[PDB]
Symmetry: D2
Subunit: 76 residues, 4 copies
Amino acid sequence: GSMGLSRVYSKLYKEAEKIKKWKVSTEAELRQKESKLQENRKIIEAQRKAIQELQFGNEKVSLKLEEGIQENKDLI
Amino acid sequence: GSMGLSRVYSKLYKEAEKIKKWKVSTEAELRQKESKLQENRKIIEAQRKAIQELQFGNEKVSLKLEEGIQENKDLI
Amino acid sequence: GSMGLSRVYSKLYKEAEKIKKWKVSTEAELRQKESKLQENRKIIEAQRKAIQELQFGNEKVSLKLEEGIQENKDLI
Amino acid sequence: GSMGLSRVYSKLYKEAEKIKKWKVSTEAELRQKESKLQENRKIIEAQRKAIQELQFGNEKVSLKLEEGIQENKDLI
């Protein structure tokens, strides 16, 4: 056991490699999750405005149909 | 035949009565036909204006339906 | 005045002519009034059925508009 | 410098603490990003189906309006 420090040294090297590798891995996954979150915010805002416009349109159509009913019903 | 003129006279009286009666009859029927003709002109003008108003209404209803279709179709 | 009867005779002839002429005149006017009355009945029945069909149509249009309103209003 | 190893030892302890702390931090942020991504998928699928139903409704309304126009236009 005249080389305990060489074994400590070798062990520390391997652990540093595992930790560096973990860093690379976890950061990369973070950037991918963040990227796809940003994409998600875009899609969600898009769909929100779309639903808003569709419902506004349905209100306009309702007013026209009501006008047509008034006109028609004076005739009956 | 010492009274031929009395027979002429009696015959003329009867014919005058028949003609007077015919006058009364035909005039009365004329007034009734004229009366009901005037009624007919009223009904016909009434129905004419009614049909006019109904068709005008149908044009207004058509414009409203067309507007509603435009509004609806922008949404599809 | 040895010809009173000739004067009666001449007067009767003239009156018969006036009455015959009146007959022709009044009958002719009767046929014309009757003719135009019959025409009037045709026009009136025509317009009646027309108004009937138009109002029936307006009821059908009303049902369609009501259906369109139901469909539209579920969306709002 | 009779205690170089004590200084190595102390340094290693501090680095292990920094790395452990980093682990806690990055995992926690991962769980939060994943959580909010899952929420995002729910919202997006919800809005998708909503837009689908709204557009289907607009097609139904269009057919009704077209029927009403047919009915109306036979009248004009």
